[PDB]
Design a protein around this ligand. Structure first.
Ligand SMILES: OC[C@H]1O[C@@H](O[C@H]2[C@H](O)[C@@H](O)[C@H](O)O[C@@H]2CO)[C@H](O)[C@@H](O)[C@@H]1O
Ligand SMILES: OC[C@H]1O[C@@H](O[C@H]2[C@H](O)[C@@H](O)[C@H](O)O[C@@H]2CO)[C@H](O)[C@@H](O)[C@@H]1O
Lengths: 822, 822
């Protein structure tokens, strides 16, 4: 199956039909106000946060899945149809949806009329802009009347979705048909309350009608695709007290054959200071200064078109700092465009919102973002520097770290689990990278506070220390670090033991005590121990850059003595000291995570890939023998047939699903560089094209999802719908896979002291040109691949031959030639 | 407008059409497993708790509102229609829905075929039973194939509704078409987990088909009313791994004209002990012992019909202990049947679940139930005695009381507000009543624990004490009690002061400090102070029955000195000591609550109703002048045009809505007995028929709701949709209105020492016969009304004339004649 294709030259994914398997969406807006739009126009919009400021209403778990998005109702002499197809689901002459960078296009054609919409949230404007181009393709005349639809969300998801007792009575909105530039509306529910803000919906034509109550608009005994006003041929011009409010404007267009009209809408998170909140001393009308302007800069096609480019350039500039030329377009589009893109949504989304994220329970994770930053520091160091400090601030003076944080209020959340003992080291992982990208040792000296509590601020370095030493303090009799609530994945909870339903495994209570340990953590800390022992050293804290350096080794050395199976690494030593993931169990002998993660860190790594006396090698050989799937590497194997009380949420999952014998994309990219690390270039790549969606276009139907995005969860060999990927769009895999090709496969990877060129792509890719902007200097890396396992590139920089993996950092505005053969 | 009528003789409300304004529902099941069914069959089912054990999926905020209930798909030679009309919304020949006591009937007729369903949850069976009677009314032959639908809810609402990341992968279910008695299914999602339970769906015929995945059943690009399998003429026999699972069974029926077939379904919260959980040592199949039986007792029409009666009798017995004979059927049906019924749903529902209650955030309230018990002690004292102890147990040794409690785990909840300073006295209000009903001073000596914490248990008396003295400790410079988070209604939060959105006013933080006081509380405590000073006295704690007695008076006396406006009672003294609800403000001078509640308690009450020098009188005169509406008495007046920072959630509401100038039914019945208390019988009644739905049948369209139920919130004079009632079905008004007629209007009201007959019904009702079962003896109260304001009844018990309002308690099996003229 296939439903579209990639148009690289245009930097976009094209879709043939609305009969996609599952709704495929794009993420609009990269700064403060993002919108989510299904190729069906289905989806919704929010400012900063969607838990709290959900501009508009979406309903998951819908029948059919996803009826309800931004819609245009069109009546052609009693004919009502929508190009979104949804909701009316009409017979279309032609249809197509193209995803873009910051935007998407929806175009629909029924009965001699063409409606095309441009969807985009443009830069600087906390508003989703829409540019319509209803064009008439008929010899005859078409005289149409157009209905625009939207369903506001009363600003708050948890309260809105779920709490109707207070909620149905607060829905007051204002109308202003005679607006300066056209005619609009202003959802202001709760504004009389503490709110000093609202949303604006408009069109740039004097609307000859409108509506602001849904039932009024659609009438009872009804569906969306059966909307009542669009069929009546005009608008009931409802006005709302209570219940659910929507925005609409009645518009008619008359167009000679081929004739056309342009219509621009403007949905905006409009907002005022408190003082100028009111147009009254009554305080009964909303200040509309800051919204008149809004719809004011977006009131022609010249401006809407003008904006379209602005961002195009925005992305267009944006992709430069890393790009590629090769034979494997499949590769190219994903690094170049679509993956570097998928990387971005995450920087901003954390894992808050997706179509699998109700984006209520989830703000931004400490762990998901620190790992998210890697994928992003190179997109925009400046923006990134802040996150480090925004995320670091959710740091306890304990060293212990807020599992996550509420995006909007920028404050810690205990809402979803607590006591995850690996978090603390993340800080170092993403952070240490900042500097590699920039050389900015400035951020260490920035002062970062503890828990957001003022007066506590310390240079960000203490946040690196605290977390480093959190482990050192917190480890088990094996010298192995403690798992607590969990290492990485939250499905491994040794200290839970629970038979009473109704309590999530992440909120559920965690029992005091243990001798319990994670080898996945120990692994990470052997990577990051050094991450900070060094940065601390360049600090001139030489005496404490060794202590730190030493604690890794006790730990380096205790991760082979005590976490080794002579074939693979132990998943963990559970609660009373017994192990987990030994060959000594029926189910779950091999767990992929210490495996990939302990080789990236370099543990048990020998002379070459030829040498098989290297635990590195034995360790990967096996995931190869055991975990590895054609679609990717299941988390561990085999999955469970019974509920391991002692472990936690892990076995709750049927076999083949998720953290239970499911392919956890995220876990996968960790192992690849292990292949590269190891020198098994050919293998890694095979892995990377394995869990990779560039190469996804093939069986769009196996996936049922977006062929352009790294989706956590592609179903397991054990499961019936294996090759079933869910939760696309918001997986650290976006950030961790870019990494690999960024830095380990295409081996263009930075350091504090120079740019390191070291490819390991297997023979599949024999030639490429990587251009990476570093420190202002462009590096043009033309490379010759011949594929020897354990082969390496020799560098010839600027015509002269050099030693190292390394290139000296070059003065800006300078352009530098690297040639490396391997 | 009107859409049905009352059929008293049958004890049921009948409906003509599915084109009701808003969905009208009934509550099935009175013990452990209740289901909610819209007359459209729309709704859902749960065991004990619906937050946690939602058997099946409902979606609020649906378009149209409420597509999705229990549905039967019928195909008549390629013709698919549903009698629920919903979801397919087809053209019906004839249609009708009758609500019942514990059940409802849905009957639909299209194209020469008749399908009638009986819906009921029967006694002892934690299952909703369905009895279908597809009958053919045609001269020709109809050969049909029938599809039954249901959409399971993965047991947990908060997790299910909102949390799709883990959720879509756990949906494993089992099928067994060849079941002993017919063919069925067993939603067992999470069962491999801590669950030791599940649900069973069946029919009693070998099903010639089935389905257990929704999309599979309906296919994509689809709605419910456009289900895909019902149209194909057979079932895809889906089986589910992950996603949303449903239950269906393919059934065909062939019937001569007038010929008919009977079909019984059985949806059940089936459950096992842990040990016998498994049919395997594999633990990969669900024990089905306890479910085979389930569908086993319900596998003929003889048993289904047999059960129908059992409960009919159940209610049928149930209404005896209080009933009436009069001219005002309008009155009769509500006391007798429909109100005493509405009373019951509440005992069980608290305010957890309604169609306005997502029934996730809300378990059972301390305050809503204590007040709920009043309405119910007489239905079933035994059941009631436990609640007192179940609810009392959510009592802090502080005296301070858990605002509410999680129904299922039976434990306190801080989820929704905390620090409500009136709660504590509720305990006395409902509890003291227990005894009046029964004489059971046993419950005081029951031992009730504190916070559910063992070892703390004390006779329930300390729970009466604690709460009594909680106030005494907690009062303001006026000697008035403190409001804290709130008195009664949660919209009056003096100590909040908040301009930052996103925090509910009940969870939001409450500021330490105050001189803030509620007069509504003070009022209550003057009613309950005595409630317990006496019970304590009959204890022989005479020395402490006076201290207690005294604290009322300081308080009786401080409620007129300090809470009086010479016209009405002060709503409260706010945070720095300034008052609220004085005639001294533009908005909100008169607040109905101290008014009704301070006259029920008897404060400022004079010689008669003629006397107008009585604050009682001035106080009600005014609510009459100010608050009183044709539809009922708005909470206070006038409502707000601006947000009183100091007050809290109160002004967030537009004028005319809810706790803001909205008719708060609940507040209303408090005042009536004030009229009765006062002697203004004629007025009270006028009030009671005023906010009363018996008399609701009139303009079914003003209400948009169930004409048989007390709905909190009927919109205000100030609001546009005034006469708009929302949130029907779960208002303490059900419990508090029964009270009034129970005890004050029809004046058949109990005490510790005898039965008190004292009507005050105004002249509208000149004659009645009340039969009330007390202490085993039936009391037949034939009464003669002539209506003098301040008139009273003289009693002639058993032919001989007596003095008092009082009748001596009569030895059981005895029947007693009361004649009273007034
Ligand atoms: O476990 C891997 C990754 O999962 C994230 O936790 C999720 C997880 O995705 C899901 O499979 C499980 O069912 O629910 C939890 C909810 O938190 C988490 O964000 C990461 O820390 C973790 O590494
Ligand atoms: O306030 C009266 C009654 O209301 C209940 O609190 C509700 C209330 O119904 C609603 O109008 C407000 O918007 O929300 C709160 C949520 O708790 C409460 O159950 C009662 O205590 C109270 O007397």
């Amino acid at each position: 199956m296939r439903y579209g294709h990639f148009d690289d030259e245009a930097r976009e994914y094209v879709i043939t039909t609305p009969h996609t398997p599952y709704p495929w969406i794009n993420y609009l807006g990269s700064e403060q106000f993002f919108s989510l739009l299904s190729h069906q126009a289905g989806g919704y919009s929010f400012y900063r946060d969607a838990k709290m400021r959900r501009l508009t209403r979406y309903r998951y778990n819908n029948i059919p899945a996803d009826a309800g998005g931004r819609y245009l109702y069109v009546n052609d002499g009693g004919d009502v149809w929508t190009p979104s197809w949804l909701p009316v689901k009409a017979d279309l002459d032609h249809f197509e949806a193209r995803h873009g960078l910051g935007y998407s296009t929806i175009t629909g054609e029924r009965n001699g009329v063409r409606v095309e919409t441009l969807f985009f949230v443009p830069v600087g404007e906390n508003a989703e802009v829409q540019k319509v181009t209803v064009t008439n393709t008929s010899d005859s005349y078409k005289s149409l009347t157009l209905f625009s639809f939207v369903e506001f969300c009363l600003w708050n998801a948890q309260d809105d979705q779920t709490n109707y007792q207070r909620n149905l009575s607060i829905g007051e909105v204002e109308v202003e048909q005679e607006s300066p530039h056209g005619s609009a509306i202003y959802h202001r529910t709760e504004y009389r309350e503490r709110r000093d803000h609202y949303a604006v919906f408009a069109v740039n034509t004097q609307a000859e009608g409108f509506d602001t109550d849904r039932d009024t608009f659609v009438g009872a005994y009804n569906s969306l695709g059966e909307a009542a006003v669009p069929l009546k041929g005009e608008s009931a011009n409802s006005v709302a007290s209570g219940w659910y409010p929507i925005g609409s404007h009645s518009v008619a267009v008359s167009l000679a054959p081929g004739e056309s009209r342009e219509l621009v809408y403007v949905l905006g998170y409009v907002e005022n200071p408190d003082e100028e909140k009111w147009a009254d001393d009554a305080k009964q009308v909303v200040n509309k200064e800051r919204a008149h302007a809004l719809l004011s800069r977006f009131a022609t096609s010249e401006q809407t078109d003008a904006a379209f480019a602005a961002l195009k350039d925005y992305w267009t500039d944006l992709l430069s700092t890393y790009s590629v030329s090769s034979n494997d377009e499949k590769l190219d589009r994903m690094v170049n465009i679509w993956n570097q893109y998928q990387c971005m949504v995450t920087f901003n989304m954390s894992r808050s919102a997706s179509f699998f994220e109700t984006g209520i329970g989830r703000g931004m994770g400490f762990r998901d973002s620190n790992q998210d930053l890697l994928g992003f520091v190179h997109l925009i160091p400046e923006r990134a520097r802040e996150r480090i400090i925004d995320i670091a601030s959710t740091q306890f003076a304990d060293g212990s770290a807020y599992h996550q944080y509420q995006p909007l209020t920028k404050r810690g959340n205990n809402d979803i689990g607590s006591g995850f003992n690996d978090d603390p080291l993340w800080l170092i992982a993403g952070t240490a990278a900042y500097i590699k990208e920039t050389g900015d040792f400035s951020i260490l000296d920035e002062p970062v506070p503890f828990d957001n509590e003022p007066g506590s601020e310390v240079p960000l370095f203490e946040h690196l220390t605290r977390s480093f030493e959190f482990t050192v303090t917190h480890r088990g009799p094996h010298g192995l670090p403690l798992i607590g609530r969990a290492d990485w994945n939250d499905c491994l909870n040794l200290n839970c033991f629970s038979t009473t339903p109704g309590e999530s495994f992440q909120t559920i209570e965690n029992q005091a005590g243990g001798v319990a340990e994670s080898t996945f953590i120990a692994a990470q800390f052997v990577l990051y121990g050094e991450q900070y022992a060094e940065l601390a050293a360049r600090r001139g804290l030489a005496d404490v850059a060794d202590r730190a350096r030493g604690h890794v080794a006790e730990m380096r050395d205790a991760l082979l003595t005590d976490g080794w199976d002579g074939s693979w690494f132990l998943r963990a030593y559970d609660y009373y000291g017994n192990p987990i993931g030994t060959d000594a169990h029926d189910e779950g002998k091999i767990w992929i995570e210490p495996q990939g993660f302990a080789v990236m860190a370099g543990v048990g790594v020998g002379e070459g890939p030829q040498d098989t006396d290297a635990p590195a090698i034995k360790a990967l050989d096996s995931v190869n023998e055991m975990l590895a799937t054609d679609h990717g590497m299941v988390l561990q194997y085999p999955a469970y047939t019974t509920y391991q009380v002692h472990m936690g949420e892990v076995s709750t999952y049927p076999p083949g699903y998720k953290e239970n014998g499911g392919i956890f994309c995220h876990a996968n990219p960790w192992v690849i560089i292990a292949e590269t690390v190891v020198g098994r270039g050919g293998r890694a790549f095979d892995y990377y094209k394995r869990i990779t969606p560039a190469y996804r276009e093939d069986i769009s139907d196996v996936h049922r999802l977006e062929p352009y995005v790294y989706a956590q969860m592609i179903a397991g060999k054990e499961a019936v719908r294996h090759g079933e990927a869910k939760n696309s769009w918001l997986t650290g895999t976006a950030a961790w896979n870019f990494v690999t090709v960024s830095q380990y496969l295409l081996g263009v990877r930075p350091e504090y002291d120079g740019l390191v060129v070291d490819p390991q792509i297997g023979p599949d890719v024999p030639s490429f040109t990587v251009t990476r902007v570093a420190r202002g200097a462009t590096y043009e890396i033309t490379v010759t691949n011949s594929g020897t396992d354990g082969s390496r590139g020799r560098l010839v920089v600027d015509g002269t031959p050099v030693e190292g993996n390394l290139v000296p950092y070059a003065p800006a505005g300078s352009t530098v030639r690297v040639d490396v053969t391997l």
